[PDB]
């Protein structure tokens, strides 16, 4: 570690801890920079040479984290927990937490190489027919707009096999090294470490109580969609009393169902709320999408994207054939100057949502950039995930789409509302089970409840239990279907997205009230509300400097996650779906839990 980056001396008491903490933050900033820069260079240009520089940068970060962590342990291990300053308890008590820096060098190298090879496998996997389809855009477009059972099967099976199978051995090794590292910081396993970010001793119980209030909405949406699929694919491929085949829902993970909107839309005579075809008709490109997102943020008197954002970002899949990580992501370089998005943007309405989602992360980074590095975080991870989604709730309203030239006719009647809420439920309610289940899987794996010999059996257990989907071809433990989802090989926690999906409705409700809006919550558009903007800005400017419970309470008036705002937003279509399911004699749920569809006669 460079001499300039190493800790000096400080006194073994609270006032010393203060000086410790201040010089700690001041050095970390340069180490963060080199690390994220090496990641950028690799993720926008996947090469063996870039992966090596990235691994070298991560080793440097670990050496830094070891030297400062050990120092914090030498001075303060027996005394930081009774420190009078709460913030210091934690700008600090993080530092006593070495993570992978607890591993000896050989294992640090092995860990860092695993992350890099897992990322590379996921991002370079292809499905071969021999010309080859990538996840983004090729397989994505197939899952989105093909209606051919056999083609969807080909893409689903191809992807799961290509990404998942080679990841499995690496993932097992990763898991063991991760646990070994976090266990030396006093956690029972890595998932306990991940859960501790919520600083909530009843987190798991609280989540389960949330899920119980939301599950009926999901069950009704599921039965109605299942019937709409049955009408198209027939009695052989759809069981009205069984799980839905996992490839027929418009998305590789069945996690968002908005792409099958045209098959379930109750009132097709009303304005078509999927504006993708109008975006194409009009010549929208990636850069327009980012500009339109940006202008929503400035209408609230939040910050525009800086020059360095426009110069540095990767907003389209490169055409020079270069290999890139296509999964959309938002980047803070920790130098208070460079922030970027890397997205292989496609011109679709759900991509416009993703753009807002990503830009929400940038906005948070811009607002908190002057805080100590350790406090440059969301109040909890779910907060970072909710910012852009909140704005996207206003964006997607018919009234707002009309304002931006994407919906000619505006209607305000109960059928239009059902079509709108149904579309929003396909995006938001369908996701809830998947949001909750992914980290349940990973928590069981890190705790050892799910050994490698049950990785796929426990995955599909949870997939069926919560989502009520089934794999469209037989799977076995050679398959590693969880590794076919980005966040698993990329080692990014998932529960934040479940938290986000609930909290965004609480924020939306608060910002709508602050904007002086007085009609149904699902019609609210906070566009141009500088009062809504100021309230959002107070949250963004806080970073992680105060407990999330108190940031939440200031913003929305309650200090907990609460399903009530989402229920209230959805209440008209909740009641309509229950009435429709009842009139159609649907069975809620999937009591034929063992059913799987047959293979097509000529498969593949
Ligand atoms: C779409 O339409 C709804 C419904 O509008 C109401 O019902 C229709 C059938 C017609 O009778 C309309 O003339 C009628 O307004 C609109 O929602 C309604 O907005 C008004 C004001 O914009 C709300 O009234 C407010 O109520 C608060 C107390 O809650 C009072 O402080 C105020 O005096 C204020 O007038 C009204 O409650 C609200 N109705 C519902 C269903 O909540 C909606 O605004 C309109 N939206 C769009 C996008 O055009
Ligand atoms: C497309 C969206 N992409 C992610 C994302 O932006 O979250 C990317 C990839 C994983 C995290 N991520 C980032 O960019 C992070 N830099 C965000 C962040 C993490 C910690 C602290 C601050 C900021 C996503 O996966 N999503 C979106 C909602 C559903 C979920 C999915 O597609 O599975
Ligand atoms: C990609 O990385 C290599 C080194 O791995 C570098 O020589 C090359 O210029 C990069 N290409 C682009 C277009 O960034
Ligand atoms: C798992 O499934 C594949 C494809 O159907 C098959 O090749 C394999 O032998 C199966 N069994 C095991 C133990 O992998
Ligand atoms: Cl998280
Ligand atoms: Zn995000």
Curated annotation (Swiss-Prot):
The active site is at 358 (proton acceptor 1), 487 (proton donor 1). Ubiquitously expressed, with highest levels in lung, kidney, heart, gastrointestinal system and prostate. This is Angiotensin-converting enzyme. Induction: Up-regulated in failing heart. Monomer and homodimer; homodimerizes following binding to an inhibitor. Interacts with calmodulin (CALM1, CALM2 or CALM3); interaction takes place in the cytoplasmic region and regulates phosphorylation and proteolytic cleavage. Belongs to the peptidase M2 family. Phosphorylated on tyrosine residues on its extracellular part, promoting cleavage by secretase enzymes and formation of the soluble form (Angiotensin-converting enzyme, soluble form). Changing residue 412 to D: In Ndom123456 mutant; abolished dipeptidyl carboxypeptidase activity. In Ndom1234569 mutant; does not affect dipeptidyl carboxypeptidase activity.
């Amino acid at each position: 570690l460079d001499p300039g980056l190493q800790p000096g001396q400080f006194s073994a008491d609270e006032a010393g801890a203060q000086l410790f903490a201040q010089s700690y933050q001041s050095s970390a900033e340069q180490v963060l920079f080199q690390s994220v820069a090496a990641s950028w260079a690799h993720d926008t240009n996947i090469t063996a040479e870039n992966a090596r520089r990235q691994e070298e940068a991560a080793l440097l970060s670990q050496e830094f984290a070891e030297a400062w962590g050990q120092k914090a342990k030498e001075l303060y291990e027996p005394i930081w927990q009774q420190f009078t300053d709460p913030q210091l308890r934690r700008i600090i008590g993080a530092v006593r937490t070495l993570g992978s820096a607890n591993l000896p060098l050989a294992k640090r190298q092995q860990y860092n190489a695993l992350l890099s090879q897992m990322s590379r496998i996921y991002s370079t996997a292809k499905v071969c027919l021999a010309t080859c389809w990538s996840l983004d855009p090729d397989l994505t477009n197939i899952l989105a707009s093909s209606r051919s059972y056999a083609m969807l099967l080909f893409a689903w099976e191809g992807w799961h096999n290509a990404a998942g199978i080679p990841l499995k051995p690496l993932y097992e090794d990763f898991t063991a090294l991760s646990n070994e590292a976090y266990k030396q910081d006093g956690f029972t396993d890595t998932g306990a470490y991940w859960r501790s970010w919520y600083n909530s001793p009843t987190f798991e119980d609280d989540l389960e109580h949330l899920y119980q209030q939301l599950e009926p909405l999901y069950l009704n949406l599921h039965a109605f969609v299942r019937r709409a699929l049955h009408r198209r694919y027939g009695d052989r491929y759809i069981n009205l009393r069984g799980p839905i085949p996992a490839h027929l829902l418009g998305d590789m993970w069945a996690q968002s169902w908005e792409n099958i909107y045209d098959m379930v839309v109750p009132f097709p005579d009303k304005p078509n709320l999927d504006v993708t075809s109008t975006m194409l008709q009009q010549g929208w490109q990636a850069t327009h999408m980012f500009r339109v997102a940006e202008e929503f943020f400035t209408s609230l008197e939040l910050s525009p994207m800086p020059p360095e954002f426009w110069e540095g970002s990767m907003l389209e899949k490169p055409a020079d054939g270069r290999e890139v990580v296509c999964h959309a992501s938002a980047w803070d370089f920790y130098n208070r100057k460079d922030f970027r998005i890397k997205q292989c943007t496609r011109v679709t309405m759900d991509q416009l949502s993703t753009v807002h989602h990503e830009m929400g992360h940038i906005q948070y980074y811009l607002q908190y950039k002057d805080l100590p590095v350790s406090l440059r975080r969301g109040a909890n991870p779910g907060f970072h995930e909710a910012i852009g989604d909140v704005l996207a709730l206003s964006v997607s309203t018919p009234e707002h789409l009309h304002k931006i030239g994407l919906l000619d006719r505006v209607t305000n009647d109960t059928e239009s509302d059902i079509n709108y809420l149904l579309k929003m439920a396909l995006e938001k309610i369908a996701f809830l089970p998947f949001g909750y289940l992914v980290d349940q899987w990973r928590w069981g794996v890190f705790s050892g409840r799910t050994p490698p010999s049950r990785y796929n059996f426990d995955w599909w257990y949870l997939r069926t239990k919560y989502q009520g989907i089934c794999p469209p071809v037989t799977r076995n433990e050679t398959h590693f279907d969880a590794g076919a989802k980005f966040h698993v090989p990329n080692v990014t926690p998932y529960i934040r997205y479940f938290v986000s999906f609930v909290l965004q409705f609480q924020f939306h409700e608060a910002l709508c009230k602050e904007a002086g809006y007085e009609g149904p919550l699902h019609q609210c558009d906070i566009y141009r509300s500088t009062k809504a903007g100021a309230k959002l800005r107070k949250v963004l400017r806080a970073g992680s400097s105060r407990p999330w419970q108190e940031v939440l309470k200031d913003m929305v008036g309650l200090d907990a996650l609460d399903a009530q705002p989402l229920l209230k937003y959805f209440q008209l279509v909740t009641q309509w779906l229950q009435e429709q399911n009842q009139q159609n004699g649907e069975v809620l749920g999937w009591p034929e839990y063992q059913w799987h569809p047959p293979l097509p006669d000529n498969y593949p």
